[PDB]
Amino acid sequence: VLSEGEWQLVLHVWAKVEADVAGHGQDILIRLFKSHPETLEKFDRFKHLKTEAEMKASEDLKKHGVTVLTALGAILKKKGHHEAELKPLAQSHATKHKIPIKYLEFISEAIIHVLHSRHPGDFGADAQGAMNKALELFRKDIAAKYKELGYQG
Numbered sequence: 261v262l263s264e265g266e267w268q269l270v271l272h273v274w275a276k277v278e279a280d281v282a283g284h285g286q287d288i289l290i291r292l293f294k295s296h297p298e299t300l301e302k303f304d305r306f307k308h309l310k311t312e313a314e315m316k317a318s319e320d321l322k323k324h325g326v327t328v329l330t331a332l333g334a335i336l337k338k339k340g341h342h343e344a345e346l347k348p349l350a351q352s353h354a355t356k357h358k359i360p361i362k363y364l365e366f367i368s369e370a371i372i373h374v375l376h377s378r379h380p381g382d383f384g385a386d387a388q389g390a391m392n393k394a395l396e397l398f399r400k401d402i403a404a405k406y407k408e409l410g411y412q413g
């Protein structure tokens with residue numbers, strides 16, 4: 261359970277992300293795919309991209325970063341009362357996209373790296389800890405729905 265103060269750290273930084281959703285989404289996905297190449301393989305849409313420059317040139321990849329970050333921002337602004345928003349997400353990522361929970365950990369690491377790079381004066385260690393808590397809470401709740409569907413593994 262995050263405290264009110266921890267939520268405010270989270271949503272303060274997040275409001276900065278909302279100024280440039282597509283740049284951030286691009287940097288996050290590129291960092292995920294470079295750090296953890298197995299992740300790229302989950303996207304038939306992007307598995308043709310072999311170099312970081314081709315990633316950065318891809319309009320389709322920047323479109324998908326905005327999709328991912330808009331859905332994440334909608335969940336964070338619920339401050340933990342996010343069951344309606346996580347259900348469909350977990351359903352599709354377990355049963356259609358086949359994404360292990362561990363790769364949710366990976367993309368959380370990429371999100372924390374990118375936010376430290378882009379917003380260091382709003383993302384000191386208090387805010388980093390908080391955002392880590394927030395992302396852990398998303399992963400706990402998606403993992404519980406995986407388990408329900410037979411995919412926690």
Ligand code: HEM
Nearest residue numbers: 299302303305327328331332348349352357359363364367
């Ligand atoms: C912060 C975590 C994530 C969020 C908020 C998120 C959000 C979304 C949304 C909103 C969609 C489209 C709607 C849907 O299919 O449910 C989507 C599609 C998809 N996601 Fe995620 N995602 C996350 C993590 C990932 C990870 C880590 C992977 C792969 C490693 C991934 C793989 C996919 C794939 C394969 C699609 C379908 C894309 C396509 O071919 O159109 N997701 N994601």
